[PDB]
Amino acid sequence: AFELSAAEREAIEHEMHHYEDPRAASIEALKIVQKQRGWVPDGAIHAIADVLGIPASDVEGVATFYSQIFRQPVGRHVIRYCDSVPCHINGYQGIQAALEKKLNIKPGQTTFDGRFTLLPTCCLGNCDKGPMMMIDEDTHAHLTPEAIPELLERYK
Amino acid sequence: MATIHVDGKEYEVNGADNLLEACLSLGLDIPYFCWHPALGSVGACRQCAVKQYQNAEDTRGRLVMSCMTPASDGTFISIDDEEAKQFRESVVEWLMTNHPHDCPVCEEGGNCHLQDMTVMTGHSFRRYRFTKRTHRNQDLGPFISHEMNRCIACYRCVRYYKDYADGTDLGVYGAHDNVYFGRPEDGTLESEFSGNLVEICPTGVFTDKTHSERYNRKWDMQFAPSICQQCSIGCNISPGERYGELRRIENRYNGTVNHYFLCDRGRFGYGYVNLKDRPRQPVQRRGDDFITLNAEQAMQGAADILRQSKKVIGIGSPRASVESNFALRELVGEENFYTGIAHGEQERLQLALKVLREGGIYTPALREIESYDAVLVLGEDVTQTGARVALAVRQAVKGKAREMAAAQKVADWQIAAILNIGQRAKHPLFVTNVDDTRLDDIAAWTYRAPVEDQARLGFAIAHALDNSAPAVDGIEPELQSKIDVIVQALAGAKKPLIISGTNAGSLEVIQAAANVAKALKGRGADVGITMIARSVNSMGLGIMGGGSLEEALTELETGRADAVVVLENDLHRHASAIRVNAALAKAPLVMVVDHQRTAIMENAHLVLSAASFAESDGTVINNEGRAQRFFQVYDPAYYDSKTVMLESWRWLHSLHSTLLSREVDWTQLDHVIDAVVAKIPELAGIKDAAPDATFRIRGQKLAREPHRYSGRTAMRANISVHEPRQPQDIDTMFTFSMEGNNQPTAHRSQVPFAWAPGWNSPQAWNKFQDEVGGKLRFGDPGVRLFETSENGLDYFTSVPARFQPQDGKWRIAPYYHLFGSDELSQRAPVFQSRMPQPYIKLNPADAAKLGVNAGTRVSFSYDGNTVTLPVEIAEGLTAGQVGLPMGMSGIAPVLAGAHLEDLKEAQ
Amino acid sequence: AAVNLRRAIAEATEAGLLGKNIMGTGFDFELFVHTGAGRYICGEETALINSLEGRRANPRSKPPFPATSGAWGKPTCVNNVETLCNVPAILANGVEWYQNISKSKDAGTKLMGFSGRVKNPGLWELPFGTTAREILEDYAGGMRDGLKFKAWQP
Ligand SMILES: Cc1cc2nc3c(=O)[nH]c(=O)nc-3n(C[C@H](O)[C@H](O)[C@H](O)COP(=O)(O)O)c2cc1C
Ligand code: SF4
Ligand code: SF4
């Protein structure tokens, strides 16, 4: 049975004090629980709702609308690669192929060890330095298919 | 108000409306989906596109959405512009790209708005060659089925369920083209108004499971204008039949009452009509032998015993019609006619009537309730007794946003803007009950207290609004502070609304509400008073009057009465079963006229097979005093010729004739109605409730079957290849066939069903109304029996004393359930799952004192009978009080206000 | 940007530039940083307001415009980072200076740039009127050797 930790509860409450309607803290509330669980467990949706005083259907709609909010289990280090047009010209396709080979997975799934999850992302606002990828909260620029195997090792 | 120019032709429309609403009300046809006459305009599907020109010289205009565009003066628009037509067809094509090929196996076929618009847009050729998106469905309970594949993302369900009905379990999930509409998880929709989704959804995602079991297409349904019989609100319905079984109940638009929405009890609580244990032929009990008689034999034999009876008394029912109750009254005599209701229930019902008929305060109609700016509910759990009034109260509370938006000059149809301007701002609402209520979410305050304390609050509010009102003693300072907020809210209101009823089981709560309303009237306010009764014709029986069930039993008990003719009443819901059974066993003759198999029938000497609302015609009076007529949907003897199910008034009228002339007289309904208006002047409006049987439209009777009804020469071929003769109707203006009139422009007010060429969906009501969302073109059906009196009643000076817990005695608090409290609806099988499991509710402290916990079975004695029930913990319930499910078989509604004695842990 | 903007706000509040009675003016302003969750539609002005309120970022309809009824039904004004970052200089160097920054009808400077297999990809603060050719050749350094220009999105 999911139970919000006191720290998570206090974090959501602090966020509620920054807006008129407590509903405005829903997006961050989903991010807090995620930062502590990797994703938003199904039980969290109802718990967050009780804290914000909003229908659980509303909390679920926000989570299933925003892409970064994960409603399905994810690996320890999520890998997001820019698939937009500037990076398409730079050659993200090679980076995607390199990641798929070194990980033996396809965009959208996690590795058997549960260390990495390959997810395509939209523009990362750094096309002058593309191709671009983000592992965890770290940004990597000027990507080359040869550097992929090494970059992944750093995220033990 | 404003002059618009559509396709050259000039039209006068209301500038306050949108072009879609305006043009639809002009008879012009514009395809649409996201817009609903009650949910406002959002501009999502982009289907109502119309070309708009800046002036009369503009030849290159722009495509705008008619639903999101004001019908301003000097507006030049074209619906037939080629670009507009092409765009409107393209919108349908985009919706058809991912649409499933399941017309033959979907329950909206022939009643689907999407099918109607595809054809209206003239889109019959597919160019898309790619894959269609799929979605897995969910379980939504026992009434609504889910088929997300058939969705078009118009957002109507979420806007109705959440923004209108204030539900919290339906939502929109996902993004882009993977948008999903359903519950956050599999489970039963919790809204008491979830059924309206079946008519709101323009596709077949939400459907009626109660019908899906025995599903039939709309063109094969025999429909009749009827009034719902599950509570006292009197909503107009369109019951439909096929093969001799009630298949589905649809909403009949009454711009004065239910408009476009019904509640779950009335929409899914009709299965009792299709029970196979119902009486179908007259039966006589000779010792242990049962003999099926015919109508003629039954009348002769019964009249023979009645002719030699010392005193024949008659017991009526709030379920029976005005005509049926009157027929029994004439058969047994007014002095020997008894209302089958408990003394207390009758006192409360008569007090409620006196307030509405002699209080000098206007009683609002269901739709008018949505226009009050402050509401006080005293003791009435409306959501569970008059659900549709609770929906109306919700719309009234949302008025603050509408007022705030009007100040910013925002159009009334722009719902999104109105909601943003409003935020969590709402009109003042205060509810009082013995425990939690479903209206607590939108209520400013909920007073949970014993019925006596709830009444004291009313007397207190009245004294504060007018010192001349009786004052109350013992109000604690804390409560007084809360009372002041209510007083200022009602005092500050321009159109206050006081709502009470007889379901609380207290005469004082009705008197308190009368005092509060009188106080506001004295302060020169547009105050409104609403009283919620218990059954379809409770107010009608109240106006007619009669002795109580207790007095009727005493007659049979002293032996002064030898014959008792009971009419559509089980008697066990109004009196002790031990007393009723014993009293009925001392009567030489006991005749029961009911359409359902009741317990009292077991020891009845004769049982007359009466018809239900579906197989009968009559008049019922709602809580507001509106007399509405219901019409027979189908002939019960069409398929089974042996069936002899006759209307109760016809049975009783014929018996009275056989008793006086030894001859049977199956009269017409109009004759019985004329008798009621002549004998009872109070029930005189019932004559104008509906036209007589001689009414015709250009010589044509009104029709009950659609013009494409099928199976005429094969539906009864199994019984006989020789087609039977069309059942004939001498009681109403409706024909039991399609050879009649159902034109949207027919000068009538009773519409059996809504169909117009091109509009096969419920959206066809638009063509039967003066203005879309308004009233029926030639007036809404129904007549209010009484008008607001010139003078009012004196303040009631009887303030009760505060409730005091008494060791041993346990005050029974009334808990009502939309699913379970009503008698006939509980008989319906689909309701078994929705109905609550048996329970007794106790204050946490009282449970600790009795050393019992949740689930513990407890034994208690009422009428010399030990009953065991699982204990449920109710924190809101005050100590000294026990909670029982009123109406649930065993717990008679009369138990409200009574006391349990030996309450202890069972075994 | 999040950690940097939050530190800047903390530094400003300490200096008394944000908070209550700013610069002894009686003006009370509180600044908050709201982080998003992935959707691009949130950029649309009305969608931003809905997202800020913790709702699905579905755009709204105008009229009414956010000016009268926007965030929580209150007067609201949405502006881009660059638009707001141009204000400080105008109130410090004067309106005349801003109008004479260039001679283009679009007054002021703009962070313009070129990307996509160019020798020097990046952005440069340039006045309106600089032809795309100048940005591509003088700054971007032209196409990378071996590549010929076919098209360009402005
Ligand atoms: C789909 C869409 C995405 C947008 N994304 C952004 C964005 O990321 N940033 C932005 O400043 N404006 C964005 N806009 C424009 C905003 O709606 C709005 O015009 C802007 O925030 C205000 O411009 P200004 O304040 O510089 O005049 C977007 C508009 C649309 C239709
Ligand atoms: S929803 Fe309408 S169009 Fe779609 S399959 Fe069902 S009947 Fe056909
Ligand atoms: S389920 Fe029905 S009402 Fe809801 S979006 Fe789909 S088609 Fe519209």
Ligand code: SF4
């Ligand atoms: S509110 Fe009463 S009359 Fe109306 S549908 Fe429900 S049960 Fe029937």
Ligand code: FES
């Ligand atoms: S397209 Fe990759 S950062 Fe912009």
Ligand code: FES
């Ligand atoms: S009905 Fe007008 S946009 Fe949908």
Ligand SMILES: [Ca+2]
């Ligand atoms: Ca009849």
Ligand SMILES: [Cl-]
């Ligand atoms: Cl008190």
